[PDB]
Amino acid sequence: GPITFGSNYSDEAPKAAFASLMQQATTSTTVPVTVNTTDHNTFQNNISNYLQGTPDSLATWFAGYRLQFFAAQGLLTPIDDVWDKIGGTFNDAAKSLSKGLDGHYYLVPLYNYPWVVFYNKSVFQSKGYEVPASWEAFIALARKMQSDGLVPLAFADKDGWPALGTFDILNLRINGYDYHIKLMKHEVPWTDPGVTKVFDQWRELAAYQQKGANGRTWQDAAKALENKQAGMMFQGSNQVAANYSAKNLPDLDFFVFPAINPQYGTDYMDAPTDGFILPKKGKNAAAAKKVLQYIGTAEAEAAFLKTDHWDVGLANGLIAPTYNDIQKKSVAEIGKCKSVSQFMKRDTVPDMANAMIKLIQQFIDQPTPETIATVQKSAEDQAKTIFR
16 A cells, blocks of 8 residues: 655655654554656646646645646645644644645645844844834844945845845735735736735835845855944745854844834834645545654654755744754744745735746836836736736
């Protein structure tokens, strides 16, 4: 009764960790597992074709638009039964990100990481900066940083994807989670005034973001933070904290993006969550489900994450013996969100995210009301052809 497992874990470290994880899954469930690895990028690029052909018993995937898309199409087996067994291990956000539009479960999540505002502890302590809970305080602090002669927010967007996070967090803070997701699915148009508010808020924020961002790699901005030339930096932990030297890492901390509209407080965050799915056309489903139940445990998460320094498991209360302090706080802060988004690139279709990358670079170049009008119009026209 062996199963096969389609895996996009092609880099050396995660490949080794996943292979180890499956040895433990066989040990626990008795189900032998053959891991079929495909180049990471290729795997995804071929996801649709892979699912409709002769897919493995189980596969690596992640939460977001495509998960729900493949589920609505009938390409994935629902795993409500798996969830009857593991559900007590996971909170409400973990549960939501694992369901299709039809309320059934299709994913078993394993880990995520956070998009939050990074700063140097020693700097805040010496200059007398207090962690800001609200937009008001956040702006006041940014203003104080400027007077103090410090770039408040290291910022970069030559990579194209980094600025999408700022769009996401402004939307989540101002319009909420349900609206952001609607926008991503194009159930709300890009010309909606909720979107105008986001860019309007950004116009204010942009006064405090590092200049020349369109020509800067995120590593160079992260290095400005590390070199104490910038007070803060908003991005994913596996990016900023990963870029820090071991020597400086102990000075690194973060807080969640401040509250703007108290109706949404800080209830939401981009925390891209990877997991596993059960391809309908896959074989040996009973056995597959047994492995998925093992995967849905704190033990599975801690085992897979041994050598992973940034990602954290979603199982309730899990603080793995190998976690660093950034990881530990990540667990606490992610665990406090009612719902977790998946970053723009996973929450909408790639064409759309890709269209937003350029339009956001354009806003960043000229953050004015006229550019906003142009951006909204261009985004909506793109969406009309993309979601037809």
